[PDB]
Design a protein around this ligand. Structure first.
Ligand SMILES: Nc1nc2c(ncn2[C@@H]2O[C@H](COP(=O)(O)OP(=O)(O)O)[C@@H](O)[C@H]2O)c(=O)[nH]1
Lengths: 151, 67, 280, 95
């Protein structure tokens, strides 16, 4: 089974911004943080930094991101792309893809050996490297959701 | 120190501070600059000294005034 | 748009009102029943304002009893109704037709139409068009008749038709109805023919929605009911008492993607409907 | 006064046609979703290049260590420290 409250708390915690103290470099929070399916692309769980219209728009954006990701997961040509960051944690291989949606930076990563995806959307000023590190450290703590498939 | 730019081997910005916050387009050039065994490099351009340090496949560039 | 119900005693006006409106312009307002017995009509007994305040007059004829005198009384009513106001739409319901054959029903409607036309020719009224509907309480006929009568009193009909046609063409919707929350009187549809079976499906969907919502209260009505063959039925409350019920077919697509695009399209349609003051 | 009502009806017809055209322009089909092309792969360097292209040679010439080595490691540590997210409990519950 699944627990919506703990996943909601995790997605709310992944909306936390960065405030560096050694170097004065403040970053804004992410626009949205959600977990979606790898089959239909609809929202399993979601969280926003800051109502029905935004939920429908976020579902549309999740559908668009999964539609773009489906062809990228099934393509082996041009595999040495600069926007792909395939990380392997705990002997589980996955592929992370970053995309630009007009003025939005959207980073998606398939949870390894499972039919789920994790998506972080931030503003255009957000750096891509910090998003990659954020999604890597987020996937590091999601070992309990490994091997989960839809029924 | 005028600013810092953190970028991995792909060149994507992890952090952009100072004048380097508005000097991103040189990163594609700086991928063609060789380093030493320790990763330290001092490259001069646009009357500025850039200190490059590569650790764990991440190059950090620090801008300093030449004068 | 207040409609006036007229007819002889024990013709069924109160029963029609109880069934439809109990289970402004467009909302199901408190209509006025008028028991009209056979008599001599008083000339201008302060009734000019009353008939000037009626958007469309509805007459009820019992098909079980003899109705030639009823048609004579109806012609007498029209004789001053059209004289006072030349913009009133005139409606006649042939009620209590549940236990009649199709050929008998068609012949009865033809006889009623011919008699009304001949009486109006005798009375000298010209340029008047009286509509006729075969209605009964026990079936869907009275709902459709009131739907046509209400549709004749909404001036924005063609624009709503275009909006619903565009919504249907861009969401793979089989059939979309713009019901009202009470009386199940559908206000607008597409250019596709109003199937009776689909109309009954949507009406009983309205009933299931309202009853289930009323069972759990005291803590914007939305519904998705998916069948085995992928055909979904969707409900979203519009402005004031209006609601939208759409039968949408998947056509071998993802259920959640179709639901998302339908939700976005219907929210856009509701935002467009906010601009036009079609509510209430 | 009825001619003013005729002009008002003409304005109402124009307004209703404009409303129909406005609500017709936001309709999105599934073909628009599948072949949108909005979701494109973007990097920081490519975004900077596009910004310079819209706004509009070897500049760099090849010639402390402790301070840079300390600051780079401290910046990486501060980046990795705030990315550590602790769950408020188990994610999947059994029967
Ligand atoms: N079978 C049948 N009977 C009807 C129908 N409509 C009305 N009636 C009969 O009409 C009676 C009610 O008439 P009512 O509404 O009180 O007449 P009013 O007070 O003059 O409007 C009931 O006893 C019904 O049996 C109908 O559609 N079918």
């Amino acid at each position: 089974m699944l627990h919506s409250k703990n996943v909601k708390g995790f997605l709310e915690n992944t909306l936390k911004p960065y405030d560096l103290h050694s170097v004065d470099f403040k970053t804004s929070s992410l626009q949205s943080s959600m977990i979606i399916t790898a089959t239909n692309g609809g929202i399993l769980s979601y969280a926003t930094s800051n109502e029905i219209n935004s939920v429908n728009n976020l579902k549309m954006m999740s559908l668009l991101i999964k539609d773009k990701w489906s062809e990228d997961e099934n393509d082996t040509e041009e595999q040495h792309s600069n926007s792909c960051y395939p990380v392997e944690i705990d002997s589980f291989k996955t592929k992370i893809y970053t995309y630009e949606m007009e003025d939005l930076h959207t980073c998606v990563a398939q949870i390894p050996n499972s039919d789920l995806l994790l998506l972080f959307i931030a503003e255009g000023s957000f750096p891509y490297g910090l998003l990659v590190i954020k999604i890597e450290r987020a996937m590091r703590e999601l070992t309990d959701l490994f091997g989960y498939k839809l029924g | 120190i005028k600013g810092t730019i953190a970028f991995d081997t792909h060149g994507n910005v992890i952090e952009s501070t100072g004048v380097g916050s508005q000097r991103i387009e040189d990163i594609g050039d700086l991928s063609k600059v060789t380093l030493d065994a320790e990763g330290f490099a001092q490259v001069q351009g646009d009357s500025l000294l850039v200190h490059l340090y590569k650790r764990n496949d991440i190059t950090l560039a620090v801008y300093t005034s030449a004068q | 748009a207040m409609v006036l119900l007229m007819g002889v005693r024990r013709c069924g006006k109160s029963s029609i009102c109880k069934v439809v409106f109990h289970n402004s312009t467009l909302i199901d307002l408190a209509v006025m029943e008028l028991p009209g017995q056979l008599n001599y009509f008083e000339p201008s007994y302060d009734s000019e304002r009353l008939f000037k305040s009626v958007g469309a007059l509805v007459y009820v004829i019992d098909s079980q009893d003899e109705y030639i005198n009823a048609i004579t009384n109806l012609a007498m009513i029209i004789e001053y109704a059209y004289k006072v106001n030349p913009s009133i739409n005139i409606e006649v319901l042939i009620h209590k037709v549940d236990g009649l054959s199709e050929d008998f029903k068609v012949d009865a409607q033809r006889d009623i139409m011919q008699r009304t036309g001949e009486e109006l020719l005798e009375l000298g009224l010209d340029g008047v068009q009286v509509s006729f509907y075969l209605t009964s309480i026990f079936d869907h006929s009275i709902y459709e008749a009131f739907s046509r009568i209400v549709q004749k009193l909404i001036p924005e009909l063609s624009f709503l038709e275009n909006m619903l046609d565009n919504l249907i063409q861009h969401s793979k919707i089989e059939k979309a109805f713009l019901f009202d929350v009470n009386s199940k009187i559908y206000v607008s549809t597409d250019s596709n023919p109003v199937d009776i079976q689909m109309y009954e499906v949507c009406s009983e969907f309205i009933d299931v929605t309202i009853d289930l919502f009323d069972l759990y209260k005291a803590p914007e009505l939305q519904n998705v009911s998916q069948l085995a063959n992928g055909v979904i039925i969707y409900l979203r409350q519009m402005i004031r008492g209006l609601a939208l019920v759409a039968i949408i077919r998947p056509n071998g697509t993802d259920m959640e993607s179709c639901l998302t695009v339908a939700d976005y399209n219907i929210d856009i349609f509701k935002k467009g409907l906010e601009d036009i003051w079609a509510n209430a | 006064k009825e001619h003013e009502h005729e002009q008002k009806l003409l304005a109402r017809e124009q307004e209703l046609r404009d409303i129909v055209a406005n609500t017709n322009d936001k309709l999105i089909d599934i073909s628009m979703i599948n072949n949108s092309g909005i979701v494109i792969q973007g990097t920081d360097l490519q975004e900077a290049l596009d910004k310079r292209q819209q706004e509009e040679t070897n500049t760099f010439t090849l010639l402390s260590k402790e301070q840079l080595k300390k600051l780079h490691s401290n910046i990486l540590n501060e980046i990795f420290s705030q990315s550590q997210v602790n769950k408020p409990g188990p994610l999947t519950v059994p029967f």
